[PDB]
Design a protein around this ligand. Structure first.
Ligand SMILES: *[C@@H]1O[C@H](CO)[C@@H](O)[C@H](O)[C@H]1NC(C)=O
Lengths: 438, 52, 49
């Protein structure tokens, strides 16, 4: 058989539904969202980390001349000076008032520790969802996993069940993000080849060990100092450490709907929001002919007690008469309240007690046992404890919290003087005619 | 050591501390709304929830 | 669970009360004032004989 139904996005909340077919008992279908897996599409842009500068041995020409060449090293720079007398422990290596010249150069490369301290800039897009479901029909359980896209059915027993699309798309990921040491930070990094001294992503590389590298961090060389050979240099602090000191808090502590986010897939998990439609195909073998199912007689509904609460705090009682033995499912045809158990042993004249919960204190609804059903009305009270994190609001409110007493007061309240007004107008017309008699 | 007051909505709230797994805590309503067949100040409960 | 109730001052008089909770039988609570002990604050002034 075939059926369809919509379920809200939420993990570990069984929903119980019925499929009705004349001549066959209505099977109880249990649907649970075991887990959620939102996986977007990712693109790698470039890596970055703390950098180490290079101060190579200088190129000193004793009583000659030199120049400022070019090279492919990232942040490569050169500069030359003349009339320099460098010294050293053995003495002065060379002195020529003008002919001496010194040439210095500088570049940079990722530090050796970068291999593990590196962060990466990611371009993300097109959030896609993967959902794991547990579906039980007639004590026939099945574990399945599928995308929410309406095209693909996940394979479980070769039963193709379609679902989606998502009611409303939610994505804590911004189009641009950064990843570091298992943490994901929402940030707007600059484009590849776009750098700013003292800013994040001052150094770039397609790979952690790629030979090609590019950066720009305001490295201007300084003139040689007094009498001692060295290379006085200058450069702005790494943007990596700066951004680290002020990167902001991780997205782990800011995502809505309690997302659980992991890096190696760059995905979210157990993050719930929205609703999903589902199409379900069922073999007719699983179905049971009604005559095989037991029949019931003169069943009554009795509310032992019920306090409005969050857990299955509502309790009900049922007295039934039957001509057969076996099992029947039970269902709450009214959405406002939902049971906790599916079926139970039956009896010729036995009675049972049932658990349930509701979104309103007004326990007025109808409930079905076997194929028959009976009404159930009562009042439930709010609880004392008002703070718990266990599953709650399994059903959303439908402005049905309005008590029957409030409806009674409202109905008798609204006036109907307009009828008196019309009667007054009619008698006015008749009296006007009578006066016209004169 | 000190104390802090955090408001919790009907939906649910996360809670972190120390270096152990967090615990999620939500809330519901407990104000005295429903009457018992006699005159009552039910409104107050409906005022406690959705002042709109 | 939590509850509150007022009882008169008197010794050896059990009072029976109920705590009501939907889905749970109302437990019978028995309260007895075994004894009373009123102790004021004292100050010694002086002895005589
Ligand atoms: C499921 O229930 C049917 C009767 O409703 C029974 O015949 C069958 O053996 C059950 N299957 C399992 C696995 O319990």
């Amino acid at each position: 058989f075939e059926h369809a139904t919509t379920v809200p996005n939420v993990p570990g909340i069984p929903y119980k539904a019925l499929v009705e077919r004349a001549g066959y008992a209505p099977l109880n279908l249990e649907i649970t969202v075991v887990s959620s897996e939102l996986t977007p599409s990712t693109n790698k842009e470039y890596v970055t980390c703390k950098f180490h500068t290079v101060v190579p041995s200088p190129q000193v020409k004793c009583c000659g001349s030199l120049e400022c060449k070019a090279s492919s090293k990232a942040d490569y720079t050169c500069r030359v000076f003349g009339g320099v007398y460098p010294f050293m422990w053995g003495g002065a290596q060379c002195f020529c008032d003008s002919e001496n010249t010194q040439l210095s150069e500088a570049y940079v490369e990722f530090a050796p520790d970068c291999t593990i301290d590196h962060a990466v800039a990611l371009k993300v897009h097109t959030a896609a969802l993967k959902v794991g479901l547990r579906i039980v029909y007639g004590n026939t359980t099945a574990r399945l996993d599928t995308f929410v896209n309406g095209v693909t059915p996940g394979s479980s027993r070769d039963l193709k069940v379609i679902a989606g699309p998502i009611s409303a798309a939610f994505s804590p990921f911004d189009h641009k993000v950064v990843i570091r040491k298992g943490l994901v930070y929402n940030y707007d990094f600059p484009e590849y080849g776009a750098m700013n001294p003292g800013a994040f992503g001052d150094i770039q590389a397609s790979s952690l060990d790629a030979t090609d590298i590019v950066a720009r961090t305001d490295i201007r060389l300084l003139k040689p100092s007094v009498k001692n050979i060295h290379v006085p240099y200058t450069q702005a602090v790494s943007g990596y450490e700066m951004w680290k000191n002020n990167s902001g808090r991780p997205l782990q502590e800011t995502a809505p709907f309690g997302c659980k986010i992991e890096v190696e897939p760059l995905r979210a998990t157990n993050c719930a929001y929205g609703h999903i439609p589902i199409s379900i195909d069922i073999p007719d073998a699983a179905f049971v002919r009604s005559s095989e199912s037991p029949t019931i007689l003169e069943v009554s509904c009795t509310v032992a007690d019920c306090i409005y609460s969050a857990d299955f705090g509502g309790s009900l009682t049922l007295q039934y008469k039957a001509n057969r033995e076996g099992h029947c499912p039970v269902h709450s045809h009214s959405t406002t309240a939902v049971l906790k158990e599916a079926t139970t042993h039956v009896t010729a004249t036995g009675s049972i007690t049932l658990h349930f919960s509701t979104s309103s204190p007004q326990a007025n609804f109808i409930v079905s046992l076997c194929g028959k059903k009976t009404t159930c009305n009562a009042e439930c009270k709010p609880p004392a404890d008002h703070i718990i994190g266990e599953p709650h609001k399994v059903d959303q409110e439908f402005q049905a919290a309005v008590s029957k007493t409030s409806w009674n007061w409202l109905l008798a309240l609204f006036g109907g003087a307009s009828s008196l007004i019309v009667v007054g107008l009619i008698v006015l017309v008749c009296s006007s005619m009578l006066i016209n008699t004169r | 050591t000190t104390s802090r007051n955090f408001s919790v909505g009907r939906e649910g709230l996360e809670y972190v501390w120390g270096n152990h797994e967090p615990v999620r805590v939500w809330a519901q309503e407990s104000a005295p709304g429903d009457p018992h067949g006699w005159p009552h100040e039910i409104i107050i409960h409906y005022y406690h929830r959705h002042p709109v």
